[PDB]
Design a binder for this molecule. Structure first.
Ligand SMILES: Nc1ncnc2c1ncn2[C@@H]1O[C@H](CSCC[C@H](N)C(=O)O)[C@@H](O)[C@H]1O
Length: 297
């Protein structure tokens, strides 16, 4: 019932330390509920143009603990959901939770590599939240995605864009972030175009404003210290402006020329929508199909 991503704060909260809350959740359960609400809110903005009544099949190509695989299937009993995660332990846990909720006939998670193992079905919606920057072989991945996307389908991503002339690559942590131009061409090469691109960089940086974090994590066990260092590094790069954290809504445009797909994508990326504007548009529409916020009693 948890999410392995950062989350957007509308403003900085003085004293709020994300590293304390994330790394010591038993000590900060209610603060962790605040975080969870923002994780839900961001996903609501990502999903809020989709018609789940039309969808029959969904894929999550880096599904974490399976939370979206599970929650979509629970909320929309007509849908079948598939997840891929390359981490065996995560796949084991997601399938155990699928079983415990008696969802096995409609939700299934596979311990597979989305850049190499062909997705097993054809999907109306393909979801990658904070997943492709962990994947070195981008063309393998987007070949896989495009080949498994129904003609009228949607791809929904939460991912990074590098605002530099060359891609941002950290070999030791297996992170690779394409530039603007590389994203334009990577998508266009696999028949995809940007329907909507939303920039959440300022809000994310607000949530990750943690002025003592570097000192704090040096007083934590090495193991604990090693897993959060990537979040620290991402926070720094967002603050510098080297990367942008964005929500992508993609469609297939197979009948458009490659050049026209490039020109479309470049135009969308030249005027990314601010998240507060997209969030306010969602609230004003009143249409919020997925996820739902948790409520007491
Ligand atoms: N090549 C690959 N194939 C499949 N999954 C991969 C992958 N590389 C990274 N991942 C997965 O991508 C996820 C990144 S963390 C994001 C998890 C989930 N989308 C969430 O929102 O909470 C992890 O589950 C990791 O195992």
């Amino acid at each position: 019932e948890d999410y392995l991503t950062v989350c957007p704060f509308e403003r900085k909260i003085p004293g709020f330390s994300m590293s304390r809350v994330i790394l010591n959740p038993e000590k900060y359960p209610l603060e962790r509920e605040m975080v969870r609400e923002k994780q839900v809110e961001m996903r609501q903005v990502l999903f809020c143009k989709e018609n789940f009544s039309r969808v029959q099949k969904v894929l999550d190509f880096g599904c974490g603990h399976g939370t979206d695989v599970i929650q979509i299937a629970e909320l929309y009993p007509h849908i079948k959901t598939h997840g891929f995660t390359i981490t065996k332990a995560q796949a084991e846990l997601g399938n155990q939770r699928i079983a415990q909720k008696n969802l096995g006939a409609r939700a299934k998670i596979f311990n597979k590599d989305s850049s190499k193992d062909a997705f097993p079905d054809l999907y109306d919606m393909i979801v990658g939240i904070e997943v492709s920057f962990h994947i070195r072989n981008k063309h393998g991945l987007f070949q896989n995605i495009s080949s498994s996307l129904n003609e009228e389908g949607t791809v929904l991503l939460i991912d990074y864009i590098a605002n530099t002339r060359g891609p941002i690559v950290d070999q030791n942590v297996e992170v690779s972030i394409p530039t603007v131009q590389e994203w334009i061409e990577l998508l266009a090469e696999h028949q995809l175009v940007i329907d909507e691109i939303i920039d959440v960089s300022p809000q994310i940086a607000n949530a990750l404003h943690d002025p003592d974090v570097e000192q704090y994590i040096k007083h934590l066990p090495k193991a604990v210290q090693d897993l959060y260092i990537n979040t620290v590094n991402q926070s720094i790069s967002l603050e510098r402006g080297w990367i942008s954290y964005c929500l992508f809504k993609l469609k297939k445009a197979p009948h458009l020329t490659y050049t026209k797909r490039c020109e479309w994508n470049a135009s969308k990326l030249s005027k990314k929508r601010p998240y507060p504007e997209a969030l306010a548009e969602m609230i004003n529409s009143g249409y919020i199909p997925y996820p739902k916020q948790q409520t007491r009693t």
